[PDB]
């Protein structure tokens, strides 16, 4: 009885874990691009500000 319960619970637990992972993956990726775009924009506005002040 035990191994049947165990293998069905590991299956279930690993289904979830895997699906959580992927979701986390999808989110971090989107967070990565937002950050990537803001750093460039941010670094560029900083250059322009300095240049315009002259």
């Amino acid at each position: 009885e035990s191994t049947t319960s165990e293998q069905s619970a590991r299956m279930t637990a690993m289904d979830n874990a895997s699906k959580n992972a992927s979701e986390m993956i999808d989110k971090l990726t989107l967070t990565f691009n937002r950050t990537r775009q803001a750093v460039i924009t941010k670094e560029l506005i900083e250059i322009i500000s300095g240049a315009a002040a002259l």
Partner: protein, 466 residues
């Protein structure tokens, strides 16, 4: 004497005076306009010319148009006559009820109270809202700030607070709409007439209204808060009593200033804000305060751009508050209202010698279990709760029950939730949280604790669960 317009760009207008230059902050009156158009002197550019900020639309202005020096800063009506009335940035009635016949006027600009005038008395102000009373209590005559991203609940909260404090208040109140929704102003106005706090037939009104909403040009929105707080300053001193000041939303002050700064010639600071951000806010906030002469209990809704609390606007505002209620988007999405972050909300009054050691210890206890749960959430995100030690499962359980017990139905939201609003007494709040921490309800289901008032309602609900 008269001056003439030499330049116009949006709200910024330059005016030349051949004789007698008007000092900074003076109000000028533009000639040839159908409705009063005020220009506020910002600086002396040189060559007998001044740079000013318009308090209304500049469409139709022509180079050469005459401008008059009024001889002083913008002055508005103050006193018992403002009650039940609605005014704009420059003191004009906008409720179509005729002239505000006061005996007193006051400049919307003034130096903040001096150090010797500060007060040091600390006394709690019980709101009946569990999260706030327990974790970061408000103080009588203190400064309260409500931070929140878009549509997270700032307005609902300030309204509940008006409903729970302003109504049961002996003194007067001032509500200032700054850069927000006009129809929210229409709803508020009609709601207060319905409840009688505003009366158009007698002199019993208890609230004075000041509005400069998101339909207004930058200069107006950048000054309406000064106007509102000027009305409250009068009640504070010139009557020696207790005043309530509500403002939705003070962020709009800084945003409006950001709009004109882009035209005043300033080199931009971080994120495109005006370089004077902190000092602009400082000379304004320091007037919103209790003095030894009288007290002002202020509640300011504070918008958070893109949900970023490190945004210069909000980040600079923290320094001005006695209590901070930070709303969270992630909390609201969990259905928990008010969406208050229990770990990012603070009060300068959370001190054992002020609220007592029982209250003090119960708050530290709640925050402790919430933080421990938080530290776990990372490991739960992948594997889940089933992988936790039989002990961590326990902190998780009590924590989740505590998160929901912090939630509560508001009276002011009844109209859309369909649930009777609730007001829980401070003694009942401490107790309830003590019992959860002590484990007295480990056998009750989470859902029993969500959206109720006092502890007894949680158990009852846990029963209707058959």
């Amino acid at each position: 004497t008269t001056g003439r317009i030499v330049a116009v760009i949006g709200a910024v207008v330059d005016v030349q005076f051949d004789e007698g230059l008007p000092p900074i902050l003076n109000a000028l009156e533009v000639q040839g306009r159908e409705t009063r158009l005020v220009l506020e002197v910002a600086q002396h550019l040189g060559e007998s010319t001044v740079r000013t900020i318009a308090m209304d639309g500049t469409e139709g202005l022509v180079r050469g148009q005459k401008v008059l020096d009024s001889g002083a800063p913008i002055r508005i009506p103050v006193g018992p006559e403002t009650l039940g009335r609605i005014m704009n940035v420059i003191g004009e009635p906008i409720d179509e009820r005729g002239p505000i016949k006061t005996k007193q006027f006051a400049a919307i600009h003034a130096e903040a109270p001096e150090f010797v005038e500060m007060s040091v008395e600390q006394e709690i102000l019980v709101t009946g809202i569990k999260v706030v009373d327990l974790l970061a209590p408000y103080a009588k005559g203190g400064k309260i700030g409500l931070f929140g991203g878009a549509g997270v609940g700032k307005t609902v909260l300030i309204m509940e607070l008006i409903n729970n404090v302003a109504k049961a208040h002996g003194g007067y109140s001032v509500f200032a709409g700054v850069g927000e929704r006009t129809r929210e102003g229409n709803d508020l106005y009609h709601e207060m007439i319905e409840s009688g706090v505003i009366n158009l037939k007698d002199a019993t009104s208890k609230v004075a209204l000041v509005y400069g909403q998101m339909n207004e040009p930058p200069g107006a929105r950048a000054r309406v808060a000064l106007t509102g707080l000027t009305v409250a300053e009068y009640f504070r001193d010139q009557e020696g009593q207790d005043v309530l000041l509500f403002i939705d939303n003070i962020f709009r002050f800084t945003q409006a200033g950001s709009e004109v700064s882009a035209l005043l010639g300033r080199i931009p600071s971080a994120v495109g804000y005006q370089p004077t951000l902190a000092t602009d806010m400082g000379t304004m906030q320091e007037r919103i305060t209790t003095t030894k002469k009288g007290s002002i209990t202020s509640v300011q809704a504070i918008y958070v751009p893109a949900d970023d609390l490190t945004d210069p606007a909000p980040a600079t505002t923290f320094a001005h508050l006695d209590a901070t209620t930070v709303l969270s988007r992630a909390i609201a999405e969990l259905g928990i209202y008010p969406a208050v972050d229990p770990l990012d909300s603070t009060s300068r009054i959370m001190d054992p010698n002020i609220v007592g050691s029982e209250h003090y210890d119960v708050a530290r206890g709640v925050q402790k279990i919430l933080q421990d749960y938080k530290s776990l959430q990372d490991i739960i995100a992948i594997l889940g709760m089933d992988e936790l030690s039989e002990e961590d499962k326990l902190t998780v359980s009590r924590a989740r029950k505590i998160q929901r017990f912090l939630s509560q139905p508001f009276q002011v939201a009844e109209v859309f939730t369909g649930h009777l609003g609730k007001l829980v007494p401070l003694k009942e709040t401490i107790k309830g949280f003590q019992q959860i921490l002590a484990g007295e309800y480990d056998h009750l289901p989470e859902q029993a604790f969500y959206m109720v008032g006092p502890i007894e309602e949680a158990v009852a609900k846990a029963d209707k669960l058959a």
